[PDB]
Amino acid sequence: SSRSGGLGINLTGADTVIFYDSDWNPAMDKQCQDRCHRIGQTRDVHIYR
DNA sequence: CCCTGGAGAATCCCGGTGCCGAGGCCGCTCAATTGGTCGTAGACAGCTCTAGCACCGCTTAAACGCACGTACGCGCTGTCCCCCGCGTTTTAACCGCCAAGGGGATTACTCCCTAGTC
Ligand SMILES: [Mg+2]
């Protein structure tokens, strides 16, 4: 869920982010899309919307 | 047979800080006092009248003892069934998020209402 899990979370294993739906303001979108590539992402993170 | 040391847990209780509202203070304010009237209704007899206090002697109708007797409230036995304490799950309000009107005030342009003198 874009709210319960959209805030600070340390997922690193996945290298791809999928945005099934958009949520108005882009702040939450950027918070969601940065839950994978934060520090330990050793591979390029691909984001699809 | 039944009593309890220990333990689990609910109670009583006063620190101990934050809050919102009980009470005080301020500014109107309207209704109880008070002058009178004038006439209304109840206190004061008064005549009346009407039901009750006590009395008399009966009359068996109820009231009470005695004896039989007998069955039911209560206390004994047993089982059984069903509701509670606890553990797990799901409705149930409440508070945040967003983009759009509604509108109420709020101020800007302006435009007619107002009023002066060569
Ligand atoms: Mg953080």
Side-chain angles (χ1 to χ4, degrees), chain A residues 1-14 17-20 22 24-27 30-44 46-49:
Chain A
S1 155
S2 193
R3 268 195 196 108
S4 60
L7 268 281
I9 273 299
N10 281 165
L11 297 186
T12 292
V17 185
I18 312 300
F19 274 138
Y20 196 76
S22 316
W24 289 119
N25 71 309
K30 184 151 55 52
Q31 282 292 40
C32 273
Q33 81 105 354
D34 265 23
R35 285 328 120 186
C36 85
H37 157 273
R38 43 209 317 102
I39 182 144
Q41 197 53 253
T42 85
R43 23 194 195 146
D44 314 328
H46 280 297
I47 165 66
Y48 304 88
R49 181 183 259 89

